[PDB]
Design an enzyme around this catalytic site. Structure first.
Site, PDB file in Angstrom:
ATOM      1  N   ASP A 141       0.624  -1.102   0.056  1.00  0.00           N
ATOM      2  CA  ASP A 141       0.082  -0.094   0.051  1.00  0.00           C
ATOM      3  C   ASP A 141       0.933   1.336   0.038  1.00  0.00           C
ATOM      4  O   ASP A 141       0.774   2.196   0.761  1.00  0.00           O
ATOM      5  CB  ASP A 141      -0.875   0.043   1.049  1.00  0.00           C
ATOM      6  CG  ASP A 141      -0.125   0.107   2.412  1.00  0.00           C
ATOM      7  OD1 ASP A 141      -0.932   0.488   3.473  1.00  0.00           O
ATOM      8  OD2 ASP A 141       1.186  -0.196   2.503  1.00  0.00           O
ATOM      9  N   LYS A 194      -0.267   2.083  -4.613  1.00  0.00           N
ATOM     10  CA  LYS A 194      -0.718   1.413  -6.062  1.00  0.00           C
ATOM     11  C   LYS A 194      -2.110   1.131  -6.111  1.00  0.00           C
ATOM     12  O   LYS A 194      -2.533   1.504  -7.225  1.00  0.00           O
ATOM     13  CB  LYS A 194       0.090   0.022  -5.809  1.00  0.00           C
ATOM     14  CG  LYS A 194       0.126  -0.957  -7.111  1.00  0.00           C
ATOM     15  CD  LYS A 194       0.990  -1.794  -6.895  1.00  0.00           C
ATOM     16  CE  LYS A 194       0.643  -2.724  -5.805  1.00  0.00           C
ATOM     17  NZ  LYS A 194       1.886  -3.502  -5.462  1.00  0.00           N
ATOM     18  N   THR A 195      -2.815   0.794  -5.009  1.00  0.00           N
ATOM     19  CA  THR A 195      -4.006   0.761  -5.105  1.00  0.00           C
ATOM     20  C   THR A 195      -4.882   2.072  -5.585  1.00  0.00           C
ATOM     21  O   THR A 195      -5.668   1.993  -6.024  1.00  0.00           O
ATOM     22  CB  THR A 195      -4.589  -0.033  -3.659  1.00  0.00           C
ATOM     23  OG1 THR A 195      -3.751   0.452  -2.615  1.00  0.00           O
ATOM     24  CG2 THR A 195      -4.691  -1.406  -3.811  1.00  0.00           C
ATOM     25  N   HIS A 210       4.858 -12.637  -8.031  1.00  0.00           N
ATOM     26  CA  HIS A 210       5.737 -12.604  -9.315  1.00  0.00           C
ATOM     27  C   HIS A 210       5.291 -13.807  -9.880  1.00  0.00           C
ATOM     28  O   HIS A 210       4.778 -14.025 -10.827  1.00  0.00           O
ATOM     29  CB  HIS A 210       7.189 -13.036  -8.686  1.00  0.00           C
ATOM     30  CG  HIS A 210       8.299 -13.309  -9.659  1.00  0.00           C
ATOM     31  ND1 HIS A 210       8.586 -14.357 -10.448  1.00  0.00           N
ATOM     32  CD2 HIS A 210       9.068 -12.089 -10.068  1.00  0.00           C
ATOM     33  CE1 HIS A 210       9.533 -13.986 -11.070  1.00  0.00           C
ATOM     34  NE2 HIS A 210       9.710 -12.763 -10.990  1.00  0.00           N
TER      35      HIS A 210
END
Ligand code: GH3
Ligand code: GH3
Ligand code: CA
Ligand code: CA
EC number: 3.6.5.3
Length: 1203
Positions: free
Chosen positions: A302, A305-306, A344
């Site tokens: 956090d 990006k959200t 990933h």
RNA sequence: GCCA
């Protein structure tokens, strides 16, 4: 600022904590460098504190062994990326090394011993990490397997060696054996688990021992499989670990197996409505050609990006007007689709699988913390997946006053970037905040607009398909007399104009030619453009030297290769994939553009097992060339089953079996099973007896026995079998029994349409006094039909649904049934139907010839029961072509009434429900599709429709007896729409009965004449049906009692009691195998025999040739082998980690296909396409191939799965 | 030996 220049120029170079956690602990410590260190040191605990409230799903497992003392350790974090970082490695490395010595088993011991050092990283990182558990194991010669880092195992074994406990470790990590031995299981977990299953089955009516016997054999497996001992060895499933041990010399004392995140929750994270979640708080207050760009967001949890992709979306709306969970948003110029890269290993999956490709990542880092140690691993991901461009958003800047620090992290980041070969110097980096971008703050609103302005300029317009060099994967090749060699397929990219020279590269010496023409089914063209299905005519090349698989490219555009390295993803058990791991050898099929090709693979360094669900790089070497270039997707298959996806990375250079077993089986197959009398019957009787019921007295009884609809489910089930099992047998000789009854029945149906055709065109009682239920439903039905159906069949509907298909027409017999022989040979056609053909002909530049223009069809005869045949009608082929069109349109329209005619499924469940409930009836009409008179259709259908149905029907009949009938019914089964027309007639009437009685119409459901509606509606339905011509089969219609049947399934108080039928004299091994499998499926619960029937099975299995007695296949793979356990099949031949069992097939022989007719069928079918977490989009549909069935059998080897 |  708030301090000085680079006041933190090295307050993070010894800490690595936040930037504003160093401009703060260095202001209340007055520039005291070695002070701030301890201000944060004893304050870095409130941090780790505010983190245990964050679920820790990801992480890593570690494994160490000291001579013969070993330890398994789970120290998990909460992300793919952290788990793989240099730091989070060192911590768990040490915490592991300091455990062999410090031989712990109490998690707390090593826990607190590090709890200090562990709040050191959490601070430096930003993730709830810790040491969740630990245990250890000691044995004589013990060993471990470590599957990458996700999962590790500890095996201790007495009497074992080096390359053995490893293999037992590898196995264990695959087959998660919850026990070491079958007998190990808690004689409580099972003393009471045999007391719950004994009810599952004793309620079904099964006698004491039967249920016991059954529950035991099934509890016996319920253990063996979850127990290392009774588990098929993963490197040799032919034999179990249990036997692998006892056979070598050793045994196993113990094992531990740990898997990162076991029993946590991982509580689903849906990225989509998530954006909407943060946005809704601030919602409170032409040219479609445009490019479609994919971006991804990747950074720390956090770090915003959200919020940023949330800010992206809103700010874009506040200005301009506009797979697997993704948010889109628009620019005056282009369109974006945005994904999150939370994992990933999870992103790679989505990128090999094609589900989410990246055009440009945007890395998200918060300026108050700057790069976290794990940001190295973020750029890494993009580096690995090879994301072409990375843009960067510095988030939450407002909370960093010294603008010297912005220019600082910005420089920090720009370093990390070029450490992984991205252009970190010349890359855009916006400095902004998403937080206040949401809050309408125009100052930071404009920063979002800026980042966007970059998505526009730095991520370049993705090269359009139309713009690349022409290429057409070849699906099929034909030689058209006088037109030349043509190939069909869909043009992948570029354009192809007539005249240009094309190269045909693929599987042999790449050859070359020149485009003579380009055409679709109707249009003839002079160019083929990307996305289009075409046929392309060449010159000079012959159709024996072109294969499907090859592509047709612009010369020099692609080249043929045989070896490449690639990134593939093996599908999990869950996703349809294999459910067994594979190893060194694996030799599957790689399906490329339009064809399977076989190859070998070699694993990278340090890997020798592979499991469903895991990514993997491999170097594939194919058994012969195929046009290819970096980025080419392929599927990986096992005889038709997809089990993995993959993409070519770099292309390289390039430098068991049973033929007498095959023949042994071939010969057994071709034998006749031989016996005294009627085997079919004998089987039924040794079955009736094994269940304590009287045998059939005579062939006479078989077809004249009525079940009792009462008594327990068990008691009824066999009782029902006893009435059904022989009911269709076609070889009783004993009867003045013919098919003359078929025509008698047929003449009666006609005679009836005659009556009702008269009665229905005459309802003037010359009065009003009398009002009738029949009359009312027709009126009500008509009105609902018109609203569902339209005034008349849309040209479009008729356009997308007309087709040839299948079997005999008036001109072709079974042998020429294929759609290609319908376009090839001229088809008959009705006087009234001629305009459609002529309309079709004006529709296309190809040849559409009527053979004859007659009004007749052929009534013929097929088997039904032992008591009667069934007359059908074989239609003029062109008439068929159009009856499929209306049939296809009615099929859609019916969807709006909740009828789905593809899915007999829904009518079977409702049968099962009717069965416990009693609120639903299953009803059955007698001579169903023979009693639908002309009169009735005409009252019900729009006139536009009715006309068309009269155009398209066959009006007159032509019997074998040479005679004639002028059909009274509207149509006979055989007609390409009588099945959908009868569905809609029946539905509409029964729905009307629903309204007339105040029942819900949506309770009506109908498949052909299998009708299901509320039990109360039936007496009314009965009367309506009587009025409108039909006769309801009182025997097969149930509106009360415990029994219901619909669409093949028969239910009794909810337990399936659907029987099986022996239709034929059993004579070949295949005949027997088939009956023995129908026995198997009807008497098995999950692979466990009712023993009453099992004896009879065993008895008749002995009639087969020996080799065929032990040659078993799983269920679902057909009937040319006995259904049983494939891992004990001596003829099974494991070949490259795919196992092949041989099955009996019908021996065929090739026939010439009609080149022209097969090419029309092809081109006409592509025309049909353009009127209609996934990778079935990698495969096509196949070339026409004709064959004649010789009565001999063959042996084909087919791919099986261990279960 | 059609139509689902
Ligand atoms: N052409 C064709 N249609 C069939 C066949 N079986 C079922 N149907 C379709 O569904 C309807 C018939 O259901 P059936 O199960 O065959 O029963 P039925 O033969 O009409 O009457 P009955 O109850 O006397 O057996 C009409 C028909 O279009 C078949 O073998 N051939
Ligand atoms: N069009 C068509 N419909 C059929 C045929 N056979 C059965 N049905 C349809 O399904 C209804 C149920 O008849 P059932 O005797 O239970 O057989 P079934 O429906 O074919 O069952 P199954 O799935 O095992 O094939 C009657 C009819 O509408 C058939 O050969 N053709
Ligand atoms: Ca019927
Ligand atoms: Ca039926």
């Amino acid at each position: 600022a708030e301090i000085t220049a680079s006041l933190v120029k090295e307050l993070r170079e010894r800490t690595g904590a936040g930037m504003m956690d160093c401009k703060k602990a260095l202001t209340e410590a007055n520039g005291d460098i070695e002070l701030a260190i301890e201000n944060m040191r004893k304050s870095g605990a409130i941090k780790a504190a505010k983190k245990a409230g964050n679920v820790a799903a990801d992480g890593v497992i570690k494994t160490k062994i000291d001579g013969n003392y070993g330890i398994i350790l789970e120290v998990n974090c909460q992300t793919d990326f952290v788990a793989k970082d240099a730091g989070f490695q060192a911590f768990a490395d040490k915490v592991l090394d300091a455990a062999v010595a410090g031989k712990i088993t109490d998690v707390e011991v090593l826990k607190a011993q590090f709890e200090e050092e562990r709040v050191a990283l959490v601070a430096k990182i930003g993730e709830n990490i810790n040491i969740r558990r630990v245990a250890a194991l000691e044995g004589d010669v013990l060993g471990s397997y470590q599957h990458g880092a996700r999962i590790g195992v500890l095996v201790a074994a007495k009497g074992a060696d080096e390359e053995l406990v490893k293999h037992i470790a590898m196995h264990v990590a695959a087959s998660k054996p919850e026990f070491i031995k079958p007998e190990d299981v808690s004689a409580e977990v099972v003393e009471k688990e045999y007391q719950v299953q004994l009810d599952i089955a004793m309620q079904s009516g099964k006698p004491k021992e039967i249920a016991e016997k059954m529950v035991e054999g099934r509890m016996k497996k319920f253990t063996g499989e979850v127990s290392l001992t009774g588990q098929p060895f993963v490197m040799e499933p032919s034999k179990t670990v249990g036997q692998l041990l006892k056979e070598h010399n050793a045994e196993v004392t113990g094992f531990i197996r740990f898997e990162v995140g076991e029993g946590i929750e991982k509580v689903e994270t849906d990225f989509a409505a998530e954006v909407a979640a943060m946005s809704k708080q601030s919602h409170m207050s032409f040219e479609r050609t445009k490019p479609h760009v994919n971006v991804g967001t990747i950074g720390h949890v956090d770090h915003g990006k959200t919020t940023l992709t949330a800010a992206i979306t809103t700010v874009l709306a506040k200005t301009y007007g506009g797979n697997t969970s993704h948010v889109e948003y628009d620019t005056p110029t282009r369109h974006y689709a945005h994904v999150d890269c939370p994992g990933h290993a999870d992103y790679v999956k989505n990128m090999i699988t094609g589900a989410a490709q990246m055009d440009g990542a945007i890395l998200v880092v918060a300026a108050t913390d700057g790069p976290m140690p794990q940001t190295r691993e973020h750029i890494l991901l993009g580096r690995q997946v090879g994301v072409p461009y990375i843009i960067v958003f510095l988030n939450k800047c407002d909370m960093v006053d010294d603008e010297e620090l912005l220019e600082l992290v910005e420089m920090e980041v720009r370093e990390l970037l070029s450490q992984y070969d991205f252009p970190g110097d010349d890359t855009p980096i916006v400095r902004g905040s998403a937080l206040k971008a949401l809050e309408g703050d125009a100052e930071w609103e404009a920063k979002i607009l800026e980042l966007a302005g970059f998505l526009d300029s730095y991520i370049p317009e993705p090269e359009r398909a139309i713009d690349k060099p022409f290429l057409l994967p070849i699906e099929d090749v034909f030689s058209i007399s006088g037109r030349g060699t043509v190939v069909t397929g869909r043009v992948e990219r570029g354009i192809i104009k007539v005249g240009e020279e094309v190269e045909i590269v693929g599987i042999k010496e790449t050859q070359k030619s020149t485009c003579t023409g380009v055409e679709m089914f109707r249009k003839l063209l002079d160019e083929g453009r990307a996305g289009e299905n075409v046929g392309v005519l060449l010159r000079g090349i012959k159709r024996e030297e072109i294969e499907r698989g090859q592509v047709l490219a612009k010369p020099g555009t692609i080249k043929p290769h045989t070896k490449f390295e690639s990134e593939v993803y093996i599908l999990s058990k869950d996703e349809g994939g294999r459910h067994t791991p594979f190893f060194k050898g694996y030799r599957p099929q790689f399906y490329f553009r339009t064809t399977d090709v076989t190859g070998t693979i070699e694993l990278p360094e340090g890997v020798e097992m592979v499991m469903p669900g895991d990514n993997i790089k491999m170097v594939v070497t194919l058994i012969h060339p195929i046009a290819m270039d970096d980025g080419l997707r392929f599927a990986i298959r096992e005889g038709g089953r997809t089990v993995g996806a993959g993409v070519v990375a770099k292309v390289l250079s390039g430098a068991s079996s049973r033929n007498s077993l095959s023949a042994q089986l071939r010969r057994a197959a071709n034998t006749r099973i031989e016996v005294e009398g009627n085997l079919a019957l004998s089987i039924a009787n040794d079955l009736l007896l094994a269940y304590g019921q009287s045998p059939f007295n005579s062939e006479a009884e078989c077809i004249s026995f009525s079940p009792r609809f009462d008594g327990t489910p068990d008691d009824f089930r066999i009782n029902y079998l006893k009435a059904e099992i022989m009911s269709k047998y076609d070889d009783f000789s004993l009867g003045i029994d013919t098919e003359a009854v078929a025509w008698e029945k047929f003449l009666a149906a006609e005679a009836e349409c005659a009556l009702t055709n008269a009665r229905l065109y005459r309802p003037d009682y010359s009065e009003d006094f009398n009002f009738s239920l029949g009359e009312s439903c027709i009126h009500m039905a008509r009105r609902k039909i018109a609203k569902l159906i339209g005034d008349v069949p849309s040209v479009e509907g008729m356009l997308r649904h007309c087709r040839f298909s299948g079997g005999a027409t008036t001109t072709n017999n079974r042998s020429y049934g294929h759609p290609s022989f319908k376009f090839a040979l001229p088809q008959a056609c009705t006087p009234r139907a001629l305009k459609y053909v002529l309309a079709l002909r004006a529709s296309t530049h190809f040849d559409i010839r009527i053979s004859d223009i007659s009004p007749f069809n052929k009534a013929v005869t097929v088997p039904k029961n032992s008591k009667t045949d069934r007359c059908i009608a074989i239609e003029p082929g062109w008439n068929m072509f159009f009856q499929l069109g209306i049939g296809g349109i009615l099929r859609d329209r019916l969807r709006c009434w909740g009828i789905d005619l593809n899915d007999q499924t829904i009518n079977q469940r409702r049968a099962h429900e009717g069965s416990v409930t009693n609120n639903l009836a299953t009803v059955d009409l007698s001579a169903a599709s023979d009693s639908i008179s002309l009169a009735l259709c005409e009252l019900l259908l729009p006139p536009g429709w009715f006309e068309v149905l009269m155009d398209l029907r066959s009006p007159k009949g032509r019997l074998p007896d040479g005679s004639v009938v002028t059909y009274e019914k509207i149509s006979s089964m055989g007609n390409g729409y009588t099945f959908e027309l009868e569905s809609l007639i029946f539905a509409s009437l029964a729905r009307s009965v629903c309204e007339i009685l105040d029942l819900d119409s949506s309770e009506v459901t109908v498949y052909g004449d299998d009708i299901i509606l509320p039990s109360c509606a039936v007496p009314a339905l009965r009367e309506v049906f009587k009025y409108v011509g039909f006769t309801t089969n009182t025997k097969k219609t149930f509106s009360e009692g415990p029994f219901r049947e619909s669409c093949g399934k028969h239910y009794y108080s909810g337990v399936d009691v659907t029987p099986f039928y022996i239709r034929h004299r059993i004579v070949s091994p295949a005949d027997l195998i088939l009956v023995l499998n129908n026995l198997y499926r009807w008497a098995t619960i999950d692979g466990v025999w009712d023993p009453r029937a099992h004896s009879v099975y065993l008895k008749y299995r002995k009639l087969l040739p020996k080799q065929l007695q032990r040659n078993t296949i799983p269920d679902g793979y057909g009937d040319g082998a006995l259904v049983g356990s494939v891992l004990i099949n001596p003829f099974a031949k494991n070949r490259g980690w795919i196992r092949y069992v041989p099955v009996i097939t019908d021996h065929t022989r090739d026939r010439e296909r009609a080149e022209l007719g097969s090419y029309l069928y092809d081109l006409f079918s592509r025309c049909l396409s353009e009127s209609n977490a996934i990778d079935q989009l990698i495969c096509r549909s196949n070339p026409t191939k004709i064959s004649r069935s010789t009565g001999k059998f063959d042996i084909q080897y087919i791919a099986c799965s261990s279960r």
